Amino acid sequence: MMPNKVRKIGELVRYLNTNPVGGLLEYARSHGFAAEFKLVDQSGPPHEPKFVYQAKVGGRWFPAVCAHSKKQGKQEAADAALRVLIGENEKAER
Secondary structure: OOOOOOOOHHHHHHHHHOOHHHHHHHHHHHHOOOEEEEEEEEOOOOOOOOEEEEEEEOOEEEEEEEEOOHHHHHHHHHHHHHHHHHHHHOOOOO
């Protein structure tokens, strides 16, 4: 059968409702991109450690978020990342 791989943006929204990290990995894995969650910078007080995380998807670096912890940073980035992708397709001519 014909391999039909369409932009299933609706399921990216399901990941916002479930697990953003897995969704960002899913989007990349299906689109031939690599999803790299790296820590950019760590600048924050001892009581509020600020971790700047950025999602490197292929040759793009987006987004850049600053969370209160490492596990948070991954998720905050992935959440925003999917929302970028979704927002890019909504009202898009591309």
